[PDB]
From a paper:
Gene expression in the IncP-1 plasmids is stringently controlled by a network of four global repressors, [name], KorB, TrbA and KorC interacting cooperatively. In this study, we have determined the structures of the free [name] repressor and two complexes each bound to a 20-bp palindromic DNA duplex containing its consensus operator sequence.
[name] was crystallized in the presence of the operator OA. In contrast to the free protein, several crystal forms of the complex were obtained. Structures from two of these were determined. Both show the DBDs of the protein symmetrically placed about the DNA axis. However, only one CTD could be modelled, although all eight DBDs are clearly visible. In contrast to most proteins containing a helix-turn-helix motif, that bind to one face of the DNA; the two DBDs of [name] straddle the DNA, with helix 4 of the two subunits binding to opposite faces of the major groove. Figure 5 shows an overlay of the conformers sampled for the [name]–DNA complex, over 100 ns of simulation; the complex remains very flexible with the CTD exploring a wider range of orientations than the two observed in the crystal structures.
Residue numbers in the entry:
A (entry chain A): 2 to 96
B (entry chain B): 2 to 97
DNA sequence: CCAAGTTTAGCTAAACTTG
DNA sequence: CCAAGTTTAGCTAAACTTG
């Protein structure tokens, strides 16, 4: 279901520390739409591996694909600092 | 360094998905102060595998709250605000 | 039902951080 | 420089979830 255009894929793999196999896997799956089973079959890899491989590149895209000048952060914080962050995301969701 | 008593360890392991070897390993370095290196030698393991096992028990205890006015927050912010949030988490990980 | 995809403890390699 | 510890991609297993 989840897929990436050619250019979104190129963005996601920009400087991403990842082997060439992982790149090929995600390319066939996210861009060319091939099932993950094919790379499991053809590479002799378990279903887990291929899925983790595609996941990295997808997560990479999600770590980008944010308005430039922004970044996603997550943490457990005190009630006060938790409150401030709540507001900041609201103000961020105005621009 | 980072160590635990028996009550904290029995609290750490409480509810954690974890085999028996990982409990052993963590008990040795967190509770009994034994180095991680000796556990690699006896169990025939790389340094990393032993380090992952310790971390899992240590993290579970650090994730046993304890001020729950605290809350898990996730947000998409500009870098200047993101930096502060990253700084805040880093304050929180020292204070605990 | 069947097939495919997800998830996570546990491992190694290996490069990196600490003291 | 070394020793001990940390980190993380990549892999399995196996139980779980989606289509």
């Amino acid at each position: 279901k989840k897929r990436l255009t050619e250019s979104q894929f190129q963005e996601a793999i920009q400087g991403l520390e990842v082997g060439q196999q992982t790149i090929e896997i995600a390319r066939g799956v996210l861009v060319d739409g091939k099932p993950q089973a094919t790379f499991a079959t053809s590479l002799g890899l378990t279903r887990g591996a291929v899925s983790q491989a595609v996941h990295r590149v997808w997560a990479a895209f999600e770590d980008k694909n944010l308005p430039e000048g922004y970044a996603r952060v997550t943490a457990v914080l005190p009630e006060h600092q938790a409150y401030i962050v709540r507001k900041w995301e609201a103000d961020a969701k105005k621009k």
